[PDB]
Amino acid sequence: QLTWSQLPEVLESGVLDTLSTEERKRQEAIFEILTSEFSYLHSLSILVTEFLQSRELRATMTQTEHHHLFSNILDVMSASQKFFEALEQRHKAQVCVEDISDILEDHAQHHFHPYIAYCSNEVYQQRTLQKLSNSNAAFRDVLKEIEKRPACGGLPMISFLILPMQRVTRLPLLTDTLCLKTQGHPERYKAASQALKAISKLVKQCNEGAHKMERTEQIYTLNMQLDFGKVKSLPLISASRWLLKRGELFLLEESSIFRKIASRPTCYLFLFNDVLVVTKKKSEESYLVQDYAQLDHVQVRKLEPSEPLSSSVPYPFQVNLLHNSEGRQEQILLSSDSASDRARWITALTYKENKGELPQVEVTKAYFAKQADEITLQQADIVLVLQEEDGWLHGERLRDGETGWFPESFAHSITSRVAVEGNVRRMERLRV
């Protein structure tokens, strides 16, 4: 609640009568890194004390599920603690802090490695929590009782578990502000800028580690679930292959003009960065491959409604395989029941095929990706809008360039020319 300029010691010092507005803002920038770190650290200690160290919660699980659920949270808290303590000694000693950029650079270079492992483990933490929630009744009961405890402040365990990912991606935003408010001081601007590069590099290797682990897990899970038995064999395992989109679509057949909305045939698509696989789903864990084609040899287009003078084919489109699993040509006629669904399929299928002029939007509430083509967004994230369709936006996040779909409901336009131009400049400052 109290800002730096409101602290009793700064008021007592009388420094405000002569302090420049830029040095004031720089002290506020330093202060906000300090208070936001403590608030985060305090939340981590609740996670550790109430969940990680719950004997009763460990008894519902195995040692392997506990490792995947909590990972190296103790190392994350310890690095946060040593970082906060360094900052707090600078704040305690002087009314006006000369600098913290050496602390930021040092810890981002030499002490924040546990963030990389924690972020990289996200896929397994999610799968472990899903399985425990779905199939472990004792876990659900103990978890429910812990969350009623006042110490949790009404928040569920999952919101504590993702705090390190949220924290690390906020440090470059806070360090960038500090750089801006340090421009009046030449040698400390250099140090702040070095700090900005170091922290941005750390966030990058966090982001790359989580992507590698999730893609590796998916390629192995899908290599097992996808049955190539009745088509020419296609090794699905690759160190570079990742899933763009998956989902069920209704099969159309142009030989029928009298289509029904009951017992509609389906197929199930797995679209990877370099290959489209067409399947029929046989169970949750098994899809029988019908055909596939290199993405390079896929074309797509919308199909037109029937000529005049309610359609069982609401939003149809057509996929042409120019060179399918037998080296021959095939077409697939598909229908989704949503306009935005069709648009997302077409966008993913044209994956293979100026930034200051793009519309910008600001995220009003957090959004958590539910599908491979969606993007997880934090409140106040800035997003460059690449496409809009039927309540869904396709955007590039400003801070890191991640791209995906999210509901338009979760953001509001930025129309100010000065803000829009400002966000663009912040973009190269932040990008690696």
Curated annotation (Swiss-Prot):
SH3 domain: residues covered: 356-416
Ranges for domain PH: 242-353
Chain residue ranges for the region called Required for RHOG activation and mediates interaction with EPHA2: 16-222
Gene Ontology CC terms: cytoplasm
Domain of life: Eukaryota
Residues of the DH domain: 25-209
UniProt keyword annotation of Cytoplasm present: yes
GO molecular function: guanyl-nucleotide exchange factor activity; PDZ domain binding; receptor tyrosine kinase binding; small GTPase binding
A Gene Ontology BP annotation from the UniProt entry: cell chemotaxis
Places the protein is found: Cytoplasm
Alphabetical keyword list: Cytoplasm, Guanine-nucleotide releasing factor, Phosphoprotein, SH3 domain
Keyword match Phosphoprotein: yes
Domain-related comment: The PDZ-binding motif mediates interaction with TAX1BP3.
Chain's role: Guanyl-nucleotide exchange factor of the RHOG GTPase stimulating the exchange of RHOG-associated GDP for GTP. May play a role in chemotactic cell migration by mediating the activation of RAC1 by EPHA2. May also activate CDC42.
Assembly, per entry: Interacts with ELMO2, EPHA2, RAC1 and RHOG; mediates activation of RAC1 by EPHA2. Interacts with TAX1BP3 (via PDZ domain).
Protein name: Rho guanine nucleotide exchange factor 16
